[PDB]
Structures are given as C-alpha cells and as structure tokens.
Amino acid sequence: RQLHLAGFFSAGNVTHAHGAWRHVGATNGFLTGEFYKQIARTLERGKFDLLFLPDGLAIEDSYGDNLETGVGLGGQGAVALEPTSVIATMAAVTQRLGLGATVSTTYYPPYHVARVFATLDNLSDGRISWNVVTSLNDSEARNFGVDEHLEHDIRYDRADEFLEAVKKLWSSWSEDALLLDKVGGRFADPKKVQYVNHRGRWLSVRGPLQVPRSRQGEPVILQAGLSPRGRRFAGRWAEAVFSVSPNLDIMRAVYQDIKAHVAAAGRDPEQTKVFTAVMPVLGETEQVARERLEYLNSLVHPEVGLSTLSSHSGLNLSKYPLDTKFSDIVADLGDRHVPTMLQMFSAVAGGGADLTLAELGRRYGTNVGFVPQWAGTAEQIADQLISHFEAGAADGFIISPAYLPGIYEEFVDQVVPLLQQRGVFRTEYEGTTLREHLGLAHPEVG
Amino acid sequence: RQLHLAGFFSAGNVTHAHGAWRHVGATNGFLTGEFYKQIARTLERGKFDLLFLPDGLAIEDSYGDNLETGVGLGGQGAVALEPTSVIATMAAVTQRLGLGATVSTTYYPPYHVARVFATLDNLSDGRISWNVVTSLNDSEARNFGVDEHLEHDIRYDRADEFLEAVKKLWSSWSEDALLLDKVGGRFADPKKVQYVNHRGRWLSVRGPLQVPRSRQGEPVILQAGLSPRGRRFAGRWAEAVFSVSPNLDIMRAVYQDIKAHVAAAGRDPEQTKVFTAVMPVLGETEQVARERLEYLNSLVHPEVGLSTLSSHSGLNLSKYPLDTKFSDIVADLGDRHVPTMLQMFSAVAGGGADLTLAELGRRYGTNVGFVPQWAGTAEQIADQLISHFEAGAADGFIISPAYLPGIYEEFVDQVVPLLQQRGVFRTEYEGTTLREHLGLAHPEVG
Amino acid sequence: RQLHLAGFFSAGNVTHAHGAWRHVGATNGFLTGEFYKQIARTLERGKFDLLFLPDGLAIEDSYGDNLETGVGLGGQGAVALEPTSVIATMAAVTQRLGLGATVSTTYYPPYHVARVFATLDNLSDGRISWNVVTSLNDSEARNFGVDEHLEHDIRYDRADEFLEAVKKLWSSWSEDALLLDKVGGRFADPKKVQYVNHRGRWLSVRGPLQVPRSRQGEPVILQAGLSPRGRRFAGRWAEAVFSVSPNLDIMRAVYQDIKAHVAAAGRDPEQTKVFTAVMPVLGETEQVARERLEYLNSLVHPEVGLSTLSSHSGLNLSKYPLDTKFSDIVADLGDRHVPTMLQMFSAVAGGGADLTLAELGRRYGTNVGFVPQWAGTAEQIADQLISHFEAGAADGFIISPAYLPGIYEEFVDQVVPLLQQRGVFRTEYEGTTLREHLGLAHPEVG
Amino acid sequence: RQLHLAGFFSAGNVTHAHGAWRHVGATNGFLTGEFYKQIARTLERGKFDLLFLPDGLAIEDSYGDNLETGVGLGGQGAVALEPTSVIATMAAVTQRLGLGATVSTTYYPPYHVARVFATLDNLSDGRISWNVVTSLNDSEARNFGVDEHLEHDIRYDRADEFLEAVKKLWSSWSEDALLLDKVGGRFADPKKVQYVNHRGRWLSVRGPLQVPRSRQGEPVILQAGLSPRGRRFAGRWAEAVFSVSPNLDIMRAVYQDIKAHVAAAGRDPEQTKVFTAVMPVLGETEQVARERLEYLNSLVHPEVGLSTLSSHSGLNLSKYPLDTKFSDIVADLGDRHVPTMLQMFSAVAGGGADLTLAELGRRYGTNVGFVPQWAGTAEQIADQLISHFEAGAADGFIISPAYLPGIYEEFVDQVVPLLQQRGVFRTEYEGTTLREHLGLAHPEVG
C-alpha cells in the first residue's frame, strides 16, 4: 500500500506562508516561465502524483477596502497568473507529473471549461485535472462585471448541472470516432460524434465538443471545498479531495467523513483519493529545522495575515484597531454571529489565551491558521508522513511550500528517497496518466 | 529594409488547404504536444517573427444542419484545441519566436482576456500577441448558451470599448510598481498599482489586473477581419494586420488601404505591419513543384470545400443540388441578392466558365478561394517574395501551410536561407520581444 | 515479426550521397548542436531503434594528393566532428532512441574506449553502442603521429584482445556494488569492484573502470567490416552488423554468411541483428520520386565521386585525364591489376558501357557504388522494405540520407506510419534500453 | 569592475568536501544526465561565467594500495565519468554558460584534443574551454598501459610543444574558408585550409584539422597547476587560472605572482583571469550557517581524508596506525623526509596541536586542506566575496560545492541576486561566447 504526494502553490506571490516572498531563498520568479518549469521538473524528479494550482480572480481588497495591504505587503492574489497557461507550460517540460488547475463555474461557461481541459488533457497525454470551484467574492465579480447573486448552496446545485454538461461534452467523441482514413477520405465517424443538446435549468450548451478524448478518458475532478454542501458535492463528483487539518485526530475525522459522503453518493470510496496539507521545514539537524521555521514565521506581517483572515472568515476585521483583544470582538458582535472557524482558530492559536487582532493575524499568516508546520530532519518528516498515513490521516499529502522554488528541491532531494527506501512511495512511475498514478479507473463514454 | 514572416495554422485538422489531413506527409499530430513544439522550433529556427493560431468555437454546421460533412470529411473546426494552451506549450520550448492566439471579445470578458494575455506575455518574456475577433456565429453561440444578437458593425463598436478596457488593465501596474523589497517588507508600491474602474456603455471591470507588465509592455494586437468596419478597427487598434489577396495588384491595393486607415486614425502607418498570405509548394525543380501542387489540390473533397464556402459567403449552399450551376443560383437570387465574395470567387475560379456548386466548392477548398498557391523552386519562391515585397505588396508574409509539419520544414530549410543571403530577411534575431522583431515601439503605461 | 530501423550519417559534410551538401534542402547545419538535436528527436519520434555515426580522422587525401578536391568540392572527411560528443548531445534531448559512435581500436586504448562508452551509457540510461573499427589509413595515421603498420588481419587479432579488455573493464563493477549507504558511511562494496589486471600480448590495463554498469549492462557492440577476417570478428563480437548490398541476392547471401559466422562462434544467431543500407527518395507520386532522385544524383561533381572511388579501390585515378575510358585504364594496369570492386562497379554502373572516368566517378558518388537507391511513393518504399524483410534480406534497415535533415522528416512522417499500420514496425517503444529495442539479452557480469 | 564566477566539481562522487556524498541533501545523481543538466541550468540561471570539470583517470589507489578505502568509503576518483561527454550533455541544455574540461596531454595526442575541443566549441556555439594537465600518476599510467616516465618539468616542456601543435590545428581553417556555394559547387576555399605538418622533438601531426573555428575563434585555455614550472606554463599559455588559497594574504600573493608570470611572457596580465576557490555554506542566519558547516564537516571519514592527504603530499600515510601523532612521523622519517606542505598543513590545521593521522585526515578531507570554508548569511557571503575582490584576491571565484546539486541552487537563489544588486556581477549575459564573458579577445588565425 503506497501513499501519494501532491504539490500545491499559487502562480504568484503567496500560498499559505505569508512571509514566503520575503525569504532570503525565494527567487520570486513567479512571473517567469523558468520558475514554473523548474518546479514541475523537480516534482517529476520526485515522482509526485501531481502539482495543482489554486486561483483567485482579484487582488485581495476586503481588508482596508483598498490595495494598501494586498499590494504594499504582498497579500493574497496580489499577483496571480492565469493557471491554465501555467500548467500548459509545465506540461510542455514534463511527461508523467499530473497537473491540475482551479477554474470557477461562477465565471466560465461549461463549453469553455470542457474544451480547455480536454485540450490540456491531450497536450499532456492524459495528465490533467480540474479543481472545481463555485465561490462568489465581491472583488472577483467586479472584475467580471457580475451583479447577480446566488446563495452559497444554490451555487453548488448549479455546479451539479455544470458538471453534467462538462461530462457530456467530454463524451461527445467516442474513443473510436477519429479515423484519419486518408485513402478513403474518412476523417471520423459522424455516428460516433454526437451533439449534446444540454438544456437544463441553469445552463444551455449544444455541443459537440471540438476535442476528442485523451488516453485517460477524462480529466480528473478535484475538489477542495469542505462546507456541508461542498462535502456533498465532493461525494458526488470528486476523484480527489484536498483537505486542511491541524492534527491527526481531525485528519482522521475529515478522512472518514469524506469517504462516507462518497459511499452515500453511491460511489466506491477507494475511487476518491483524500490528500491532507502539511508544511514541512527541513534541517540537517532538528535544531536547524526549528531555527529555520522560526525565521520563516518571523517574516509574516500581522496585517497581511489579518487581510487573509478577513477574507476566510467573511468578517472585515479592518473595521477594528489591531490592538483589539478578541474578547471585545466577541462582545461587539455576539457569540452567535461570530463565524465558528474564527472562534476555533482563536482558541487554538493562543491556547485559550486572549490575543490582539494583530497577533491572531500574524499567526494566521504563518500557515493560514490550520496547516501543520512540521520542522525536523528529513528522517523525522518521513517518519511523520509515514506514521500519519498508516494511522489513516489521508491517502496522500499536499506539500505546502514554505518558499519557492527551494523547499521543493529540499523535499525531493532529502525526503522522497527516504519514503521510497521505506517502500511506501513509488520509486518510479508505473503508468503514464494521472489516473494511473492515483489508481483511478478509466471512465467509459456515456 | 527587411520583410517579416509569420506562420498561421489551425490547432486542428484544417487551415486553408482542405485536403491537408489526407496528404501522405501530414502527421495529423494536432492532438499532441510534440506536433506544436516541433513546428514552433522549426519556425524559430527559421527566425520567423511570429506564429499565430486562428480559432473557431464550433464544428462547422450550416452545410446540412448536421455533423456528417464536418466530422465525416474533416471540415472547418472538426478538431479545434483551445489556442492559448497551445501557444503556452510553444512558448515553453522557444525563446524568440512571437506567438499569437485568437480570443473572441464576443464570448469572453475583458478581465479574462487581459489576464490570460498578460500571463502569456510574462511566461514568454514579451513575445505574445492577441488576434482580436468579434464575430457572432450561430453554432458557436449555441455552444456558449448565447441567444442575444448584435449587428456586425456594432460588435466592433463594442470591441472598441473592450480594447479600451483591456488596455487600461494592462496599464494598471506601473513598470516600477513591483518592489520585492524583502528587508523592508515592501512588496509593491501601492501608489503605482491602481484600480481601473471602467464602467462603459457595454462593459464593467474594476481591476486592477493581477498581472504586471512583461518586458514588451503590452501584448501585440493582431487583426485579420478586413470588412469595411474591420478596416477601421484595424486602423485604430492593430499593430499587425493579416490579409489575403490573390495577386500583387490587389495586395498593393489592400496594403495602401490599411496604411491609409491607420494614418486616418491618427496613428503612424509604419507602426502597423501588414502581412499577406501565400501558400507555397516547393519542388527541387519547377516541374516537381507543379506536380506536388496538383497532388495537393486533388485531395480536396468538393463538399468540404462547399461547406467552408457557405460559411464564408453567408449562404447555405447545401440547399442546392451539387450539380446546380452558378447561373441557376445567380438567377434564383437575382444579381442583387448574391454576396460579393461569391461573384468575385466565381469569376476568378471559373475564369469565365459557369461551374457547378460541386466544382466551385472543390476549387474553393484548395485555397479558401483567394490564398495564392505559389508552386516553384526555392529560388523562384524567394524571388517572388522579394519581388512582391519590393513592389509594396506587404511588410511581410504569412505562410499558409499545405500540410504539417512538413511544409514548414521545407520552407525554413529551402527558402529562408535564400532570403537571408539576399539580405531581405534577418539572419538572427536582433531583439528578444515580438515588438522588437516587428520594429514596434514599447508602449508607455497609461 | 518486426523489422528494425537505424539512421546513419556522418557528423559532417557527406555520407553516401556526394551531392548532398548542394541539395536545395540541405541545411548544412553539421557544425551546430541544433542540427543534431533535430535529427535525433525526429528519429525518436519515428521510433527508430538506433542512430549511429561513422567517423574518419582525416580529410580524404588520396585523389590529386592534396586538399583541392576534398576541401574545394566537399569530399569525405572534409568536415568531421568528434562523434562521441555528438551522440552525447543527442542523448541529452532524447529518451528512447539508441545511439552509437565509431571509435577506432587503432588509435585509442581500451581504458579510454571503456570509460567513454560506459559514461555515455550511464548518461543515456542504457541507450549506447560502440561501432568497433580497426582500419589503418595513411592520412589518419599522420594526424596521430603513428608510424607502425600492422597488417589488416593482424589489426583484428589485436582487436580481439582489445574487446576482451573493454568487456573486462565493463565488468569491473558488479551491478550491486554501489551502495550509497549514507548513514553507515558505506559508499560501495569493495569486494564487488575488482582490478582487471589485463596483461596480454597486445595490451595492458589494470583497472578497475571508474564507471559502474548502466541499466543495459554493457553498450551494444556494432560491427561494419565485411572482409573475410572482419566477418570472423563479427561472428565473435558483433551484436549488430551493418552491411551495404546493391540488391536482394547479395543481401540474402551476406545475411546467411554473417549468421553462420555467429553460429560457428558458439553464439545465438538471433542475438546478432543484421541491418542493410538503403537510400530512399520519396515523392507523392512515383513520378515525383523519380524526378527528385534524378535531381539528387545530378548534384554529384565528377571529381568528388572519383576521389571517393580512388580511396575505396586503392587506385589513384587522379593520374588519368577525366575523359579517359575505363577500358583504357584496364589496358594501363592489365586486367590482373584492376581491383575487383572497381571492375565490378564499372560493369554494373555502366551495364556494359565503356564509361569515362568522370562518368564513373559521378555515378559512384551518387551512392558510393552499392547503396541501393529506392525512389517511390511512401506506400512503395514501405512495400519494398517489407518485401525484402520477408525475403530474408536483413533484420532491419539503415536509412542512408539523401540530404539532411529533411529526408528523415519525410521518411518518419510518411513511411513509418505505413510500416506501423502493417504491423511490421513498433508503434511505441516497448523497453527503455537499446538492448530491449534490438531484442538483445542483458549480459551478466563476468 | 565586475567579478567573475565559476562552478567546479567532479563528474562523480567527491570534489573537495569528502563527506559530500553522505549529506542528507546529496542526490548522488552523478551517473545520470539529469543531475548534470540541472546543475548547468542552475549556474546559467545564475549567470555564471563557466562550469569546469576536473578529471582523474584512476580510482585513488596509493592509500592501502587497494580499492578498500577509495571504493569502500568514496574516495577520490571512485566514480569519474569521462568529462567531455558530460559537458556536451550540459552544452545541449544551455546557451550562454561557459564549459570546460580537463584533458591530459600525457595520455592523448594533440590531434585528438584539438578535434574534441573544436567540436565542442562548435556544438556549443563558442562556449568551450580546455583545462590543460600534464601530471603522471602511477595508477592512471597503469590504466593506459604506460611505462615511460618523464620528469615533472619536462612534461611541461613537451606540453609547450603540445599546445603549439593544438593551436596550429585550430588555425588550419581560416574563418572565411567555408563557402557552401551550392549553385557554384564550391564547398570551401582550398587556399584557406592548410596542412599543419607539425614535426617537433616530441610530436608529429600533419593536419589539417577536420573542424573549422567556432564564433570565439579558439577554445579558452585553463590552467590550475601552480608549481614553479606550472606558473611559467600559465604565464605563456593560460587565459584563466584556477587557484586554491586558504586566506587573503595568500590569495593576493598568488594573484600578483601569476599576473607577473604572464607579463614576463610578453602578454597582457589583464588578459589572464585569476579565479580563487571558496566553499560557501549558507544559512538563514549566521547561526544556522555554522550548524550546517559543522554538520557537513562531521560527515568526513578520517581514512578518506587521510587517503587524499597521502596522495597530495606524496607521502603514503597508510603505512602508519591512524593514532600516530604527527611529531612521531617527523621523528620516524626525519624533518628532511616529511613533505613541506604536510608539515605546513599539520601546523595550520592543528593551530600548534600535535594531531594524530586520523584527525589530520579528517580535517584535510573537509576542504582538501586549503579551500576556505565560508559559513554565513547570503548577505555575509556576498560581503566577503566583494571585499576579497576589492582587496585584489582574484578576478573571480570558483564556488566549491559542499553538496550537489543543492548548494548551487542555494547559492544562485540567495547570493547571486545580492551581488547583482550591488553592481559587482552581471545581471545578464552581455555576449554569447566564453571569451566575451571573461573579457578575452578573439584570437587571430595564425
């Protein structure tokens, strides 16, 4: 039984560690092709299952109602390259590594999503995946000139239909439809390419898709949303789920809940892979590791962290002074309208203690609050990865990068070989497609 | 005085030569990364200014109201990969060649177009261009769930505002905005990144763009629609224009007309480069060349040709029997109710003869009616390119490929060196960006 | 039953076709890395077993006893890059294609040959082969300051010992010798890395070799000398043999003879692959191919053909006026003193005619006398390849290039797919090493 | 005044840090193409002037006169790939980085050296250099079957003629000799390609070379031998000199002496670039840096260190028990019979302490005695590089790698940008050739 590894980072300035761009070792090459080529080549060298890019469609604005924090201090989405271009770039220099990107159902039509991913799936010869997102953020909508509004759970119901339409399009070409019979003059079999004529409540798309199926049949569906409604959506469609849990117990709880939602939807739980995020910080000795972690966290500016904390909680904390104790906010708002995640992070952050807004933002900025920072030698990190895996924490891990590209080099050079030697991680790619890497079946047409 | 060269081909089964996919030398590798990498490398080897991909968002459908012709015989857009993904793939393995893709202002919003192109521009280090189209075809609209109409010329007025919006976005980061002051903790200067707040008759987009400017400042704007309104739009926005004229006389006419449009828009005519299409067929001897062109043209199926002829003329000719003569159609519609392009093609193609639909379609399918086929030795081809260039046919040539990838190998290996030896074409890239290749100024932030 | 395919060309100005550099399509990129990278990627795209480079260590000097013909007209060895650097370059951009280079046992010691090939083997991850040569040419010898003159058959006796020593060197590391046990501090097992202590009549080399075994164990041995002694040598050592035969009768005879020498050396005939050389000229129609062959052959300058003929015949034909008739040369030396290959070539090239020297050199220069030129459509070339294979002409074919790089593009694009459709040639690489492509067993240590 | 940077490492298991292969971060990928491709791409990304590989032609044998120490523990030359193949591999994936290799005049003839470097120079488009070596090591000699024994200083006399011979060969083709006049049938001008006819006391080679000159005229000559004779040899021939000095006083003395030997030979001192070796060890903080250096030095096995100390000193220390004190060795042998470098090393490495052989070996193995280890922050290393440069220690630095590939990543990502920000190191390559990077002149033919 073998675990899976995935890479994950913003095509831009910041992922989870909000002081990353400040690290002495950060090249900040996020505007260059070579930076992405290098990361992709490195993860492939480490035989990673996949490298996956999140996406945000606006510079983070909520905190301050202006760009002062986001642009000035390097906040979420300050720089965010269009993800599909980036992964096409990475596909061009790799041949096994799986590649995925977030694309929103909210701002793009089903035909676009269908065709862009079928295209990437063919260009990469079956290595592509799509992270389905359904969010509606104000700054994003204003970038797309959207004015309408749909309730959280309704957006998911709409996404159900979106997925149906996309899957229909992906099946519009039989796997034996393309003929290229030069002599006969038969390009394809028109009986094997069908219109889709999808016309549901939310969406209308005629088809057929202009792109045949890759050798993996269809792109792998990835899902990250862990809301009650999201978990349901995941159980139905998701082939791999990305989760963030601060410790083993929650990891295990999240794991079993996801697997259950999948069984509930009528699907094989073992056909949905569950990854959990960790942020390793290596050192030749444990002491060096801890020292390096301390340095990394010290780079976090309290306000960038607060800015991200605002976005994630929905609460605009720029309204309050930074020295505002969390108490005064509880009382100013009432423990009934204060998002649970906030109260959760708060309790765990200072350990029941009472923190200033500045101090909570600073800590949230280190690891987006809940991503475990593991500091140790490569042997320890490997031991922890293995011990968590055997304990049912997850089927694989998302390695959240402390700084780029350096941390991935260190992880691939130092940790992957220990995992391989222990027999818990591939020494070589067995198949050629992302589905083969994750152990997923080849979906059939229809 | 040096000419420019560009390649142009569909990321799919067919471009101008409708028999291409049946050619004994066609690899039909259009679903694979290596096909596109190979071509990009080949044109970079030949020091080409750019290669750009048209786009079509549906399998052509009119002819027959079905897929039998498009899918069965390999008509326009039977296979059509999403072009930005493809050029990203190409940028990844090249370093000087300019790259361009068509994205429609009809189906995509300004923020999206701005971001994807700024992203590509950065990834390629300033070699990207955007071919602007504004068409609204029925079958494409059905793929996108669009039911709204907008008259041809109005789509251009809408396009004007789109271009304004996009250009503002590309100017939302000053070129000295990004700081990366790690010590100080200043990521970027918030006074040098600004909201766009575009709110027009047609469009709304807040900004700022989440991507700063590449080293060429802004992607190059390409234009290919040469209707009266297209000519005005080119005059106002185009930095490169792509045209099809069957001979020198008409090339000269179009060339002067485009340059006149640019000056009339208050711009410098020398800052808009005009490319004219030609479809070369080489042979070691002129006799071999002729035989090869004859072989190529013999591969066209009359009905694929006919279907493209219907699309381009606006008339669905499938309604008529294949053996119907043109007169029998010209009379059934009246000398008034017959598209100008159709009369012009009918006159040139038949040289006076009254042809069947079948025969017009077959002839149309060889060269989309008006792309000149130049069969000759390399010396003859180079002589003619130089001759037309000196005669003011164009600033450059778009080389339309009879079949791929082979025709580009031949042209780069055989013709380019002769242009280079005659001194009319670069022996090496002088600069690194597409703007420098084209001799275009680096725009200032607005 | 599948046939094998190999490329073969000099890293320089000329291989078999002596007008190749003058061909309109010749890039003459033979001084550039890109030329070799392109060809290597192309043969790999066509799934060739192997690309192999000859070598010659002096500009061909005999004819006219100067550099006038060699340098002025582009004779054999005029430009000749060191082959191992070339294949290393090609190894860097390919993943499956086999690669081979000629290195002479005459001028280089076993230790050097063993180390360079083991290095290439490791760098290419098991794709390398060595073409063993034992020849002694006067101009080459003067470049290396060699005075000794070993007799033809004796050079092979030395080479027997040479091969023994190289093979010993390649066995100096067991395949499990290298440990890399970082924690225990154990680099390799010194019991499993052994001195060779070779001390024979011809050679001394202590060892051990400083390079462990690749995943294919040892580089593949290639042999191309078909003299009686050379055939005994091939029987003992060769794993692939390369031969030139003008027609099927001769091909079959050479095939049987080689396999018999192998059987007589106590080895398995099926473990020595025989490749025969063919020079295809493609056309869309057979008429096009024939005109292209005519054009190619018209490029040969009489005196460069004469030069190569002089070297191969051992007879300096520069003494004679170019208009001398062959019969007058026979008269000059007496029938008994005319080299047999020269008499035979004259009869065959002339079909009984009494040709001038010029005309004899011209025809010889088209194909070095005996490489069969096959002009036809792709279907015809494929038919003939299959037909000869079925008739027992060879286990595979060396495709001698009329001109580069273009001919290999045509061959791979046009002929290879037809061989694949017919089931006679791999559609994909089954293994990763050169031995796996050729169906050769991985040799064991000792 | 900008400084120059060079990488330097053995294509194998150990360079200067004898514990390097055991480092948690070492990939030990030295048998694979990707390892070398990664490092070349990294140094090119860092805009290095050059990467240079030393060579050894035998597994270090002296210590214990067996393979026990070298093979068992990973001593000098345990694994050593042939270096010309390795740099070809590297040249294939870079386009600016200079590349050099050690080839011995002792074991190879002028023609071979001249042709291999002219080939690499052409393949890399003028980026190559040759480190000239004249040493005679018993074990190397046994691998090449050499019995002859020339005195240290005479090998340098013979090397003088060798170099003469090589340069004549590199001048055998004028830079305008090659014509490629296809129409006219003129390949090259036979008047511009000349025989060499070198006949000297030591060597004979006729020529001409079969390789024209690259963009940079001739390969750059590198020299690293600093014996009195070697310094003279460097004065006459070297264009770049590589030197190991433990401190600023010595660096400056070496620098001035070399500059003076060049001027004494009639050459411009500014046309010979002096590089001095340093082994940086980086940390986020000086404290981390110091822990990392301590970790790295802790990996050295006393016997491997001793083995190299024995080879370099010329005194076989394996005869003595490891616990033997140095004073006891001097007493046993006589002060006249213990090499000076060895007594000097004992004195400096122990600071006056009387150390055992084991502890001497352990210390020597960290840095081959005299390569300065610099542990600090990126800012500190930049500072030291800059101040040593300004104090006249050298024209540039060789960065000796603590472990591979990781240390070059750290150095390029962390240190290079600070050097660039301070204006003492190029932000981009100005020219394309190695001669341009080093500020050297293009040599004139003849």
Residue numbers in the entry:
A (entry chain D), B (entry chain C), C (entry chain A), D (entry chain B): 5 to 450
Question: What do the authors report?
Answer:
Then, DBT sulfone monooxygenase DszA catalyzes the oxidation of DBT sulfone into 2′-hydroxybiphenyl 2-sulfonic acid (HBPSi). BdsA is a DBT sulfone monooxygenase that shares a 79% sequence identity with DszA from Rhodococcus sp. The TIM-barrel structure confirms that BdsA belongs to the group C flavin-dependent monooxygenases.
In the structure of BdsA, the electron densities for the N-terminus to Gln4 and Ser451 to the C-terminus are not visible, likely because these regions are flexible and disordered. The crystal structure of BdsA shows that there are four molecules in an asymmetric unit. The elution volume of BdsA indicated a molecular mass of ∼220 kDa, indicating that BdsA exists as a tetramer in the solution. The root-mean-square deviation (RMSD) value for Cα is 0.165 Å. The dimer interface is extensive and consists predominantly of hydrophobic residues, which are derived from α1, IS1, IS2, α2, α3, IS3, and IS4.
